[PDB]
Amino acid sequence: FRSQTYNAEEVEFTFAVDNDGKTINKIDIDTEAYTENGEWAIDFCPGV
Amino acid sequence: TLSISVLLSLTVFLLVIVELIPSTSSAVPLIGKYMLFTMVFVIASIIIT
Amino acid sequence: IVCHTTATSPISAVTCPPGENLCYRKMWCDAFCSSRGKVVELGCAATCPSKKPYEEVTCCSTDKCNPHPKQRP
Ligand SMILES: *[C@@H]1O[C@H](CO)[C@@H](O[C@@H]2O[C@H](CO)[C@@H](O[C@@H]3O[C@H](CO[C@H]4O[C@H](CO[C@H]5O[C@H](CO)[C@@H](O)[C@H](O)[C@@H]5O)[C@@H](O)[C@H](O[C@H]5O[C@H](CO)[C@@H](O)[C@H](O)[C@@H]5O)[C@@H]4O)[C@@H](O)[C@H](O[C@H]4O[C@H](CO)[C@@H](O)[C@H](O)[C@@H]4O)[C@@H]3O)[C@H](O)[C@H]2NC(C)=O)[C@H](O)[C@H]1NC(C)=O
């Protein structure tokens, strides 16, 4: 993901902060409502 | 000749079957279980022959 | 016993039906935990309700021991 228009000195990205005060540097999943794919399972999903 | 040609026909029909049955990997389909049963039955019959 | 319940809108304190006494609060996260926090479920049961691997369940017998996280007992 990136901004199509603005450079690093115009728009700057940061990760959202969880309600517990921890940075969510990963793809979030609704573990109670997500359903695994019929062919692939997800192990890790870090963000940088 | 009989057993191996039956096996060949079953393989061709498996090539047919793959067009019809779902390619899901979550669990073995009942039709897939029956197909595997038939294939193993043919193979065992060939061994015994 | 009297426990808070989420069956009614808004949450209200309702006396347990006969046969059940324990208050409980179950909370687990969903896709909207980004800003809204964990889901909240309130009710009464005859025994400490079952817990899913991702769901935290709390059980208490005291009065008003299951309020909403943003409200005091
Ligand atoms: C195929 O899959 C689908 C899903 O994929 C599945 O769908 C489920 O089907 C089952 C039954 O088949 C459903 O279970 C029923 O759900 C009813 C709905 O309950 C919800 O809504 C209630 C809102 O109405 C009241 O509340 C509002 C404000 O709260 C008020 O304004 C209204 O006037 C009204 O009073 C609400 O009460 C209820 O809350 C309960 O549950 C939540 C948990 O989410 C909990 O926090 C609360 O404390 C409370 O317990 C909920 O939000 C429900 O009414 C119905 O109740 C039956 O069982 C209860 C016992 O639990 C009895 O008391 C009652 O008399 C009824 O017999 C029951 O629970 C389920 O909700 C569906 N879920 C989904 C996601 O669709 C299909 O079943 C599947 N198909 C097959 C064939 O299995």
From Swiss-Prot, chain A:
Stated family: Belongs to the ligand-gated ion channel (TC 1.A.9) family. Acetylcholine receptor (TC 1.A.9.1) subfamily. Epsilon/CHRNE sub-subfamily.
Resulting phenotype, R2L: In CMS4C; significantly reduced AChR expression
Biological function: After binding acetylcholine, the AChR responds by an extensive change in conformation that affects all subunits and leads to opening of an ion-conducting channel across the plasma membrane.
Protein name as catalogued: Acetylcholine receptor subunit epsilon
Assembly description: Pentamer of two alpha chains, and one each of the beta, delta, and gamma (in immature muscle) or epsilon (in mature muscle) chains. The muscle heteropentamer composed of alpha-1, beta-1, delta, epsilon subunits interacts with the alpha-conotoxin ImII.
Coiled-coil ranges from the UniProt annotation: none
Gene: CHRNE
Associated clinical condition: The muscle AChR is the major target antigen in the autoimmune disease myasthenia gravis. Myasthenia gravis is characterized by sporadic muscular fatigability and weakness, occurring chiefly in muscles innervated by cranial nerves, and characteristically improved by cholinesterase-inhibiting drugs. Myasthenic syndrome, congenital, 4A, slow-channel: A form of congenital myasthenic syndrome, a group of disorders characterized by failure of neuromuscular transmission, including pre-synaptic, synaptic, and post-synaptic disorders that are not of autoimmune origin. Clinical features are easy fatigability and muscle weakness affecting the axial and limb muscles (with hypotonia in early-onset forms), the ocular muscles (leading to ptosis and ophthalmoplegia), and the facial and bulbar musculature (affecting sucking and swallowing, and leading to dysphonia).
Span within the parent record: 166 to 213 of 493
Subcellular location as annotated: Postsynaptic cell membrane; Cell membrane
Curated annotation (Swiss-Prot), chain B:
Transmembrane annotation, as ranges: 2-22, 34-49
Family of the protein in this entry: Belongs to the ligand-gated ion channel (TC 1.A.9) family. Acetylcholine receptor (TC 1.A.9.1) subfamily. Alpha-1/CHRNA1 sub-subfamily.
Full-protein positions shown: 264 to 312 of 457
Localization per Swiss-Prot or TrEMBL: Postsynaptic cell membrane; Cell membrane
Tissue expression profile of the protein: Isoform 1 is only expressed in skeletal muscle. Isoform 2 is constitutively expressed in skeletal muscle, brain, heart, kidney, liver, lung and thymus.
Substitution effect: V12A: Increased length of channel opening
Domain of life: Eukaryota
Disease: Multiple pterygium syndrome, lethal type: Multiple pterygia are found infrequently in children with arthrogryposis and in fetuses with fetal akinesia syndrome. In lethal multiple pterygium syndrome there is intrauterine growth retardation, multiple pterygia, and flexion contractures causing severe arthrogryposis and fetal akinesia. Subcutaneous edema can be severe, causing fetal hydrops with cystic hygroma and lung hypoplasia. Oligohydramnios and facial anomalies are frequent.
Organism of provenance: Homo sapiens
Annotated protein name in UniProt: Acetylcholine receptor subunit alpha
Extracellular side: 23-33
Curated annotation (Swiss-Prot), chain C:
Coiled-coil portions: none
Example GO molecular function: ion channel regulator activity
Similarity comment text for this entry: Belongs to the three-finger toxin family. Long-chain subfamily. Type II alpha-neurotoxin sub-subfamily.
Subcellular localization(s) per the UniProt record: Secreted
Protein's name according to its UniProt entry: Alpha-bungarotoxin
Gene Ontology cellular component terms for the protein in this record: extracellular region
Intrachain disulfide bonds: C3-C23, C16-C44, C29-C33, C48-C59, C60-C65
Binding partners and assembly: Monomer in solution, homodimer in crystal state.
Major location category of this protein: secreted
Organ and tissue specificity: Expressed by the venom gland.
Key words, A-Z: Acetylcholine receptor inhibiting toxin, Disulfide bond, Ion channel impairing toxin, Neurotoxin, Postsynaptic neurotoxin, Secreted, Signal, Toxin
Additional free-text comment from the UniProt record: Is identical to Alpha-bungarotoxin (A31) from B.candidus (AC Q7T3J2).
KW Transferase (keyword) present: no
Its job: Binds with high affinity to muscular (tested on Torpedo marmorata, Kd=0.4 nM) and neuronal (tested on chimeric alpha-7/CHRNA7, Kd=0.95 nM) nicotinic acetylcholine receptor (nAChR) and inhibits acetylcholine from binding to the receptor, thereby impairing neuromuscular and neuronal transmission. It also shows an activity on GABA(A) receptors. It antagonises GABA-activated currents with high potency when tested on primary hippocampal neurons.
Keyword rRNA-binding: no
Shown residues within the full chain: 22 to 94 of 95
Top-level lineage group: Eukaryota
